[PDB]
Structure formats: structure tokens, C-alpha cells
Amino acid sequence: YPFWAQQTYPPTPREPTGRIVCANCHLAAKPAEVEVPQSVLPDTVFKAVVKIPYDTKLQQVAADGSKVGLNVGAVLMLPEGFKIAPEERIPEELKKEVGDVYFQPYKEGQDNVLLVGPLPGEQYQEIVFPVLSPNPTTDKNIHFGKYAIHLGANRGRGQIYPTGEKSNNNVFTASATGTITKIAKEEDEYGNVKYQVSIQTDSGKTVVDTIPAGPELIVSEGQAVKAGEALTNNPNVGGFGQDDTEIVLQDPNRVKWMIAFICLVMLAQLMLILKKKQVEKVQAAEMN
Amino acid sequence: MANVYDWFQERLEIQALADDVTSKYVPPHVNIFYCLGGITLTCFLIQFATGFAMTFYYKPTVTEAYASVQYIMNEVSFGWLIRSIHRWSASMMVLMMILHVFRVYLTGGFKKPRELTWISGVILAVITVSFGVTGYSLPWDQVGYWAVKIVSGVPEAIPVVGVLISDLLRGGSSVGQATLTRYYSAHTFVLPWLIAVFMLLHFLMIRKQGISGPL
Amino acid sequence: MATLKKPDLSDPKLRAKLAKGMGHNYYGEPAWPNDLLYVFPVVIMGTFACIVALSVLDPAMVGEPADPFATPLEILPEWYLYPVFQILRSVPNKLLGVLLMASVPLGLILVPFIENVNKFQNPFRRPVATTIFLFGTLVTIWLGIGATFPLDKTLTLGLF
Amino acid sequence: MVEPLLDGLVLGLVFATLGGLFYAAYQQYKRPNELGG
Amino acid sequence: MILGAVFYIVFIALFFGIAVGIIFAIKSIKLI
Amino acid sequence: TEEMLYAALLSFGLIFVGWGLGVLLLKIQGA
């Protein structure tokens, strides 16, 4: 979960390579988008939409073995001095599009790096962030410019626990090589089903291989496919995404004077072409 | 006064100059696309000014390159502007150049007496790309650094010399301070001179042979 | 009207040049004022104004500081280098792709020699040429876009 | 990175230019000569 | 897009206006 | 990837608008 990233990787969700620690545990891969405006004036509330698409009417493997829907998570990384808008200032329709999301900061002080989720798949295909632009005029180590925004968005439960143990939403190999012996189907009063399997002859050979419930098995009886392999199929219908984008913290003064200059130019061009025409005239009296 | 024009006319025959310009005519097959060349140049002159501007604040040292670029954006008056213009006009030079080539071709202007003009052009293009590649890596940011690491390694494929080439290219076996030093010399000193020599040829040959003919 | 001067085709010195492939700045509208003084500053000003405008509206980013131990996934040359970069990663032979790189300049050098077989300018009056060009231009744009893509939907461009 | 605005700017102008080029080649290939070569 | 398109049409129309206008102001005081 | 589309779209199309507009000036002036 987003908060497990925090737990395991405290100072930042992304490494120097730009990766994002999430992908250490959510090993599948599906797309992640992030739209924001091209430019925002300073001290302004604007929208930042994080998209985490996946086929809504399908389901995945739960812990025990069930077959549950799935949730979406995400870490968004905004540039320095950006933060979630103060709710007094979020307008109305926006409040609504945003919903009941908890914009949890990655660490004390870092209000521009927001963890989010787990939320339920079907309402949060898309996740609105109402954010507020900093103001270089007041905070004096914030400047106008173009700055990067980084998304890592996941959906569907992962493959490894903070403890190091594997989950049940991945596939299992086979340890060693040999001919398969037994396909049990345990289910002790707690910690339910537990298909137990093993292999042999070759040399020594008896190693035991438990495989949690939820996956399939598509390796049947007989068999001997070799060193750690196949026996499970892939339960995982989840996966992690990433995106990056640009945003310009613009100063209206810059724009105003640029528009002024342009006009001065268009004007000076027109003025030249007019002059040319007036010369094409005095010229046609030199032909005849 | 004391007629100024006359002053110069006695000595340097200033008139000849004028008579040479005003004696030139531009034929009717010459359309707007016959500008792509003069624009690619205009884009360069902008590089030359904004570039030189930045030589007054940029520090070609691994300790200070990145920080100095930051200084230009944040602290130098209009620094954000000078540098953004440099970045955009770089791309527009390469582009307008590609368009300039398109015409020339689809106008057969590289034919018959003008194949040297075309040849020189191809060199200008290789130079212009080298401007790009070298400048790219001067901020010593992440993207620029890894760019240097890659391209510097390409010549090592070549068998006899290659390595010897790459070491000249990067000032050692590996990217490092030597590399930034040499890329800086390349971008701010070598390539401007080279590109002026070859622009000078290009233009001299054009003035000599005039524009290509009609279609 | 415009402003015009027809070629004096009775001028031995002009004809001598038209003969060689180059009398063409002897006839037309006068270069000065007409273009140089009056419409130039128009072109130069417009060029400049679009660049300033672009530079204000979409200014230059500053990236992460270089890190010797960390290659950014998603690392790309400038756009005018996409095509070559594409090639370089869809040609398993290192040394080969490098020569394919070099042959872009070398090749372009050889064009005036080859196409000198005849002496037409208009591309409609030169089929074969105009075709290999359009083909190249297309393949180049193709390889270029290809770099925008993930390694293995690259060539197929993701639609076959 | 990939600079979307610039990349669209390229293509836009590339195609627009090749277009106008062939079109001026045509406009000429069908109204030829004028003035005597 | 819509707002940009409005401002755009007005902007040129406005300058196209100045142009045409000042041809004739310039033509019918016979400067041209 | 829409920041791009606008840009290709417009760089291309506005060329024809400026062309047209210029031609238009020419007509109202008399070439």
C-alpha cells in the first residue's frame, strides 16, 4: 500500500534513476497517466488528474483465495512549494470530482509529495488532485519556471510483503527437478487451502513445495518439467504504472510584456510592407 | 557637413559596393521557401548572441556547471529569457535547416554548377548537430551527462583508431571534468569558428553563382 | 505591375551565364530596396518574435543533477536524433549501426553526383528521384516516432 | 524527455512545407517558361 | 480551445483591420 | 500527448490562414 512505501523507503518514493520504489513489490505493469494544465499562474487552485485505467468488470485473487475486486493506489510528486489546496479555496464542482481521498504527505514537511489510496477501483479510475500553486513574490526561494511532476500509480494487490515473504498473487516455480508425486488439498481450521506438492527420483529428491490458494495449477499428474517452473499459472491481473509531465509556473508580467512586444512587431512589419508598396509606386514612374 | 560619402568614395571606392548590391535581381520562381536558408542563419545569429551572453555566467566545471545554469534561470536578470531563447532557437535552427534542405532538393538547386554549395551545406549540418550535442551536456544534468557517456563511446566501435578518438573526445578513458572542459571548448570556441568558415564558403559560392534557375 | 525587369537575352555576357546554369540574378524584381530593406526585417522580426513568444510560454526546464551511478530510464537524445537513435537500437550489431549512422552524411554528399545524370529541377519531371526521396523522408519520420515508443512496439509502431 | 509541443511543431511544419513545395513545383510545371528560360 | 479561438479571431481581425484601414488612410491622403 | 496534437494541427493550419489573409490583402489592394 502507498503507506508501505513510506514505511519501507522513508526519505523518498523515487530513486536516482527516476524509478519509484513501488515497482519493487507490484511487479506487473499497466499504464498510468497524469494530466495537469500547461501553465498555472501563481497562488491558484488547479486540477491534477491521475489516471489508473483497468478493465472494470474483472476481478482478482484475494489473500485467502477468494475472488475480490481491487483497489487503486498512487504516489504523486509535485514540484517544490506545491500542495493540496486549502478546502476553503477549492471551488464546488472540484470538491465533488475529488471525493473522499486522503492526501497523505510522504513525510513531515513534504506537502508536495502525496500518497493516496487504497481506494476502490470503480469510483477511482481517475483521481482529481486540487492543488495550489506557490507564489515566488512571497516565498522567496520559489521561482517562476517549468518544473517536473512524477506519477507512480498502482492497481491490484502486490507480490511481496514488507516482511519479505511472497504473496499469493504471483506464480510459484518448483524448487528442483523430478517427477511430481502428490497433489493434496489441505485446509487447517485457520489459514485455509494449501495445495501441497513434491517431486523425485533423479538424485536425493523429496523436497516439499507448498503453494497458497488463489492461483491455478495447470501442471497435472505425472510430469517432470525441470528446475523451478510453470506449476501455477499467473493469477496477477494487477500492475504498476509511471508517468512524468511538465508544468509552467508562469508570471503574468512575463506574458503581458511578451504580448506587448509582439504587437509592436506585427505593427512594425505592416509599417514596412506599406512602405514597400509606396516604393513600387514611385518605381512604376521610372519604367515609363 | 563636408560630404561624408565623398570622403569614403575617394579612398575605398564605396560606390562599387552599392552598385554590386543594387545590380542584383530576384527572379519570379523564387518563392517564400527560398527563405528557409536566411532563417536558419537568423536562428544562428540568435544562438551567437544568447550563447555569448551565457558565457558571462556559465561555469564549465563539474562542481559549478549545474549550479550556474540554475543561477542564470533564477537570479540573473532576464537569464530565464536568454537561456530559453537559446534552447528554442537551437531547435528551430536544426529544423529550419531540414526544411532548407527539402526545398533545395525539390528545387534541384544542388545540381550542375552548385554541387560544392550542397557539399558545404552537408558540412554545416554536421557542425550544427555538433553544436546541439555539445550544448545539451553543458548543464551537467542527468540527461546531458548520460548523453556524453553514450556518444563518447560510439567511436570505440571503429577498430584501429576509435579508442584513440574517444579519448580525445572525452579527455580520458571515462567521462569526467576533462570531458566538460573539452565539450565547452568545442561548443564555445571551436564550432563557432568552423561554422563561420563554412558559412562563409556557402555564402560566397552562392553570391558568385546566384540563385538556381526556374522549374 | 509588381516591379520587374525582363532578361536582356541579347546580352552576350548574360547568355553566357544562362548557358552555364546561372544567369538568374540578372532578371526579376530588384533585390534592393524591395526585398532586402523592406521584407527582410519582416522575416527576421517574425523569426525572432516566434522564438521569444515560445521561450516565454514554454521556458527551459532544469533537470536533475548528474549521477554517475544512475542511468535514467526514459533517456532520449534530442528530436532531430530520434531516427538515428532508433536505428542504433534495432540493429543488434554495434559496429553496423554506427556505419548506418555515418552513411547519412556520406550518402547526402553523393546525391548531386548521382542525380547529375540529367539536369531537371522540377521534381515532377524527375519521377525516380522524387520517389526515393519521399520514401526516405517517410522511413525517417517512421524511425523517429519509433523512438518515442517502448523498445519492442518500436518498429511495428504498435499496429502489427 | 520528449518535448510534445516541439515535436508537433516539427511535423506540422515538415508536412506543411513538403506540401507547399510540391505544390509550387506543380504550379510551375503547368504554367512553364515565362520570359524565356 | 473555444476561448482561444475567439481571442484569436478578434486579434487578427483587429490587426487585419488596422492594415486595410491604414492602406486607404494612406492611399486617400495620397501617401501611396 | 494533446499538447502535441494542438501544435501539429496549428503549425500546419495557421500557415494556410496567413497565406489566405495575405492573398486577401493583395486583392483589396490590386496587384
Binding site: 500547461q38 501553465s39 498555472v40 499562474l41 491558484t44 488547479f46 508562469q250 503574468p252 506574458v255 503581458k256 511578451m258 504580448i259 509582439i262 504587437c263 512587431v265 506585427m266 512589419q269 505592416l270 514596412l272 510592407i273 | 518563392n31 517564400i32 527563405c35 | 509588381a2 526585398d35 523592406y38 521584407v39 519582416v42 522575416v43 522580426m45 517574425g46 518574435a49 516566434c50 513568444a53 515560445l54 516565454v56 510560454l57 | 507547399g20 509550387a24 | 476561448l3 482561444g4 481571442f7 484569436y8 486579434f11 487578427i12 490587426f15 | 496549428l10 503549425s11 495557421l14 500557415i15 490562414v17 496567413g18 497565406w19 489573409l21 495575405g22 492573398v23 490583402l25 493583395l26 489592394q29 496587384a31
Partner: peptide
Amino acid sequence: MEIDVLGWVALLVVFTWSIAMVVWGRNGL
């Protein structure tokens, strides 16, 4: 938050107007 938009329009308008003034200026193409 749409001087931001007048902003881009200025660009599109010099691009257009510059082409337009060249064509006009040189009875052009």
C-alpha cells in the same frame, strides 16, 4: 487564468501575421 491563453494566441498571431505580411509584401506564395 487566461491571460495564460491570450498568451499562446499572441504566438499564433505573429506566426500567421508574419506569413501574411510576407505574402502580401512580395505578392507572394
